[PDB]
Amino acid sequence: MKGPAFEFAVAMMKRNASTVKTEYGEFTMLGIYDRWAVLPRHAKPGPTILMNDQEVDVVDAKELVDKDGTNLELTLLKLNRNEKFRDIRGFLTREEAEVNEAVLAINTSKFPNMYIPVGQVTDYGFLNLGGTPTKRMLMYNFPTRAGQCGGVLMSTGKVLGIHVGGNGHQGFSAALLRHYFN
Amino acid sequence: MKGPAFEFAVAMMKRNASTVKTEYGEFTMLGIYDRWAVLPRHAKPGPTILMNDQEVDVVDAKELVDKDGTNLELTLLKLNRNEKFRDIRGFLTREEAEVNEAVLAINTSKFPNMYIPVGQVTDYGFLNLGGTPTKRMLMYNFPTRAGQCGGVLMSTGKVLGIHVGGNGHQGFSAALLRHYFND
Numbered sequence: 001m002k003g004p005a006f007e008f009a010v011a012m013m014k015r016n017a018s019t020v021k022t023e024y025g026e027f028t029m030l031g032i033y034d035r036w037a038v039l040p041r042h043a044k045p046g047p048t049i050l051m052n053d054q055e056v057d058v059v060d061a062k063e064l065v066d067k068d069g070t071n072l073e074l075t076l077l078k079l080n081r082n083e084k085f086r087d088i089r090g091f092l093t094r095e096e097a098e099v100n101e102a103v104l105a106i107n108t109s110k111f112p113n114m115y116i117p118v119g120q121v122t123d124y125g126f127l128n129l130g131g132t133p134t135k136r137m138l139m140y141n142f143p144t145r146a147g148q149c150g151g152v153l154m155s156t157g158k159v160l161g162i163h164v165g166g167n168g169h170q171g172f173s174a175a176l177l178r179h180y181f182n
Numbered sequence: 183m184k185g186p187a188f189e190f191a192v193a194m195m196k197r198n199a200s201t202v203k204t205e206y207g208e209f210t211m212l213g214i215y216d217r218w219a220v221l222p223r224h225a226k227p228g229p230t231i232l233m234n235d236q237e238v239d240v241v242d243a244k245e246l247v248d249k250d251g252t253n254l255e256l257t258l259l260k261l262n263r264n265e266k267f268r269d270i271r272g273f274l275t276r277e278e279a280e281v282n283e284a285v286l287a288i289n290t291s292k293f294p295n296m297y298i299p300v301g302q303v304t305d306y307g308f309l310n311l312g313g314t315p316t317k318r319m320l321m322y323n324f325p326t327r328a329g330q331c332g333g334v335l336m337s338t339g340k341v342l343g344i345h346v347g348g349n350g351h352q353g354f355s356a357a358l359l360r361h362y363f364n365d
Contacts, residue, residue: 001192003185010183010299112325115297117192143294 001101001117004156009103009115012154015086017107021050028107028150030162031085032076032092032181035059040150040164040174041073049077056081064180071134073164073174076181091159092178096123096136099155104140104163104171110147118142118171121153121160127172129165137164138173183299184283186338190273191285191297194336197268201290202332203232208290209332212341213267214274214363216260217241222332222346222356223255231259238263246362253316255346255356258363273341274360278305278318281337286322286345286353292329300324300353303335303342309354311347321354 012030018037020029024044029051031037039045041063048055057080064072102121106114124139138153144166151163153173161173194212202211204227211233213219221227223245230237239262246254286298300322309319320335326348333345335355343355 001189003189005185006188006297006299007183007185014183110327111293111296112327113298114293115188115299116295117297145292145294 005101005103006115008156009105009154013105013107016088017152018052019107026108030152033087033089034084035079035081037077037079038162039075040162041075045077066135071132072136073134074162088159089178089181091157092176094178096138096175097160098123102153102155102160104151104153106148106151108147116142136175138175140171141169142171143169144171187283187285187336188297190338191287191336195287195289198270199289200234210289210334212334215269215271216266217263218258218260220344221257221259222344223257225257227259248317253314254318255316256344270341271360271363273339274358275340276360278320278357279340279342280305284322284335284337284342286333286335288330288333290329298324318357319354320357321352323351324353325351326353
């Protein structure tokens, strides 16, 4: 709900976010650094994606799991493209973060450049996501809608996580930790 | 994109906005002062509205036109409710305002608690709206969507207008002038 948090989020999205269609749907995608981006795992990208309505070759992709194989609900993907992402790894937390006021930024064709104050973010930890045990989930309470994965959960100077699910009045992000990219 | 605009919009929506259904649609509704609120004219509220899923009687309704009868695309309505709105007439401008950074605030079942940076706001003036000549139109550029009408257009310390239309990459609001709410 804070002003600096919205202004940071708008700048982040304009500079690093894009709209991405895979064979599983339409998602917000956040560029991280170089040609590396992140999607919710269930975007399930293939060898090519549509990024801002343009076919882009995916030259590497890693679905993230922790040291004991547990799902983290994130996929990193390396794009074939000449433009590099602005390196935003300095905005990523070292460990699952909590905040009093966060902003969820959405950039899809259903929600074109939309920003939602979601209030407090909780390092909630374990969730079973429709059968799949999952870890490092951040939770927040707001009127959710379909087509919001993978919005970017942010605070002032902080890229906290990628929105990966939600229902009713509960949404959850996968913490976007800096050692995923180290 | 401007932070002060967002912080002001959040405070304003939190205190004075509600989600309203008429016979014709679902709308963001901003309360202005006392029991007076404002809707896009085409919301066409009847004797009773649904305000936050609750029936509220409409005491008075005034479709606004200028001194020569030209549609302003706004309806002011007075509600039968005991709670009073926070008086926000002090954040209305006296004539059509222009800003370099504005926010459009939506709260409907289709766009829950959503804020859109729309950038610069122009006093565009005259628009032919669905065959209806209309004046005091503010306009701004952003990827528009259906169901955003009634969105509240705001900048720092300013409730600029009520979103009443748009298409493509162009939206427009009816200016929310201070003198509409005298008495």
